[PDB]
Design a protein around this ligand. Structure first.
Ligand SMILES: Cc1csc(CNC(=O)c2ccn[nH]2)n1
Length: 435
């Protein structure tokens, strides 16, 4: 009760204080065979996280670690296998029976307790993002079974509060995915969740639109900029997993970008988000057109939309801010692959009017960015900025393989930058072997 409480408090301390377990998940996995009963005392954990002390209170850093450890135990119980990296997977009768009973316990428990957790820690972005990994493990049918409607209402209230308070990409994305899970995974509560979502979206589209209008009519305030960016971020996050096409967001994104090319003075983060949002609008237009039975004019309206957006990305390669060039580059390399001739696979030859061959000018600019921003002369931030340039080249590599860009001009650039490997590498290789 408090006995298991002590063991959990010290388990959190051994985790943080020793560098003997770097990954929470790997710690839990390793103790799992021997300490399952303890590691699934979820009532004990939420009690620690929600109660006020008598004495000795938990420190902000230890609270964080307990939430992270709790969520790993919730996964390991639900999935009934070691985490990604410690795998090898056939369950016994009793292992299977235990998994069902565990999923039951943590669903009933966290439906009640997850809104109370999100309420208390609502401003801690890292913590809220971690709590919102929990619903994916819910046995969602139980939101009906337990006459538990009052607690679905409570989670939706708390997700609303979080999204309204936060702009961090991890938080919002966590909110987006939770709605997705809550919505399309059980018909019983699908209708209730859909009404909460679209009211949330509605309130953010109105605020976005009023702020776009404010910015563009204006001299332009710091408030005008905050208001656009803050609302655009929430909508960009959600527009990946949710079809927000019914709200014409591409329209205002398009103006923001046109204004930031013309007068060249649009803040870098607005341009990046405005690009990402426009992209997600187009992908969702594409899906409705693939699955629908679309007319000639449907195709030609989406085409005009796509050619104007490829134009905007091409122009945005010339933006001073390298985060914009990167975003524009990434989108060019997705779109040029998606609206290639691949689009006429699986008997979908109706889509030919949607096919786009990049011109020489554009191909040459997609070559430039690689020389300027992939292949550059000169801690943790650099292993990360390397993986990005890797992804940027890999996204560009696909265009080379299918001759969407000039495959020869490309390999010339790869000659120029590999020269020292081809001129001195054998000599460097054998030298390093003999030390
Ligand atoms: C037909 C075609 C495709 S691109 C091209 C000429 N551009 C380049 O080769 C290049 C290298 C660096 N920047 N641009 N010709």
């Amino acid at each position: 009760m408090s006995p298991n409480g002590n063991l959990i408090r010290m388990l959190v301390l051994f985790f943080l204080e020793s560098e003997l377990h770097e990954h929470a998940a790997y710690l839990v996995d390793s103790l799992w065979e021997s300490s399952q009963e303890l590691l699934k005392d979820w009532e004990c954990m939420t009690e620690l996280l929600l109660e006020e002390p008598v004495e000795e209170a938990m420190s902000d850093r230890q609270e964080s670690a307990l939430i992270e450890l709790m969520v790993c135990t919730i996964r390991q119980a639900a999935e009934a296998h070691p985490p990604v990296g410690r795998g090898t997977r056939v369950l016994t009768a009793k292992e299977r029976k235990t998994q069902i009973d565990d999923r039951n316990k943590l669903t009933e428990h966290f439906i009640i307790t997850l809104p109370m957790l999100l309420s208390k820690y609502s401003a801690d972005a890292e913590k809220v993002a971690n709590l919102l990994q929990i619903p994916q493990y819910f046995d969602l049918e139980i939101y009906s079974t337990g006459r538990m409607e009052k607690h679905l209402d409570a989670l939706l209230k708390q997700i609303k509060f979080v999204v309204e308070k936060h702009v961090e990409s991890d938080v919002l994305e966590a909110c987006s995915k939770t709605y997705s899970i809550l919505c399309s995974e059980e018909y019983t509560i699908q209708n209730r969740v859909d009404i909460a979502r679209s009211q949330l979206i509605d309130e953010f589209v109105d605020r976005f639109n009023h702020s776009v209008e404010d910015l563009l009519q204006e001299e332009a305030d710091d408030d005008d900029i905050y208001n656009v960016l803050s609302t655009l971020k929430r909508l960009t996050s959600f527009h990946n997993a949710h079809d927000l096409t019914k709200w014409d967001l591409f329209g205002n994104c398009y103006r923001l970008l046109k204004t930031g090319i013309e007068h060249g003075a649009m803040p870098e983060q607005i341009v990046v988000q405005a690009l990402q949002c426009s992209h997600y609008s187009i992908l969702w237009q594409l899906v409705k057109i693939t699955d629908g039975s679309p007319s000639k004019e449907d195709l030609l309206v989406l085409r005009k939309t796509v050619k104007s957006f490829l134009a905007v990305c091409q122009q945005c390669l010339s933006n001073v801010n390298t985060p914009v060039k990167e975003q524009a580059f990434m989108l060019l390399c997705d779109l040029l692959m998606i609206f290639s001739h691949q689009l006429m696979t699986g008997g979908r030859e109706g889509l030919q009017p949607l096919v786009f061959n990049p011109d020489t000018g554009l191909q040459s600019e997609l070559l430039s960015f690689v020389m300027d921003h992939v292949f550059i002369d000169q801690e943790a931030n650099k292993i990360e900025a390397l993986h990005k340039r890797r992804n940027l080249l890999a996204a560009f590599s696909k265009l080379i393989i299918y001759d969407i860009v000039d495959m020869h001009a490309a390999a010339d650039i790869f000659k120029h930058y590999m020269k020292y490997y081809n001129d001195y590498g054998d000599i460097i290789k054998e030298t390093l072997s003999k030390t």
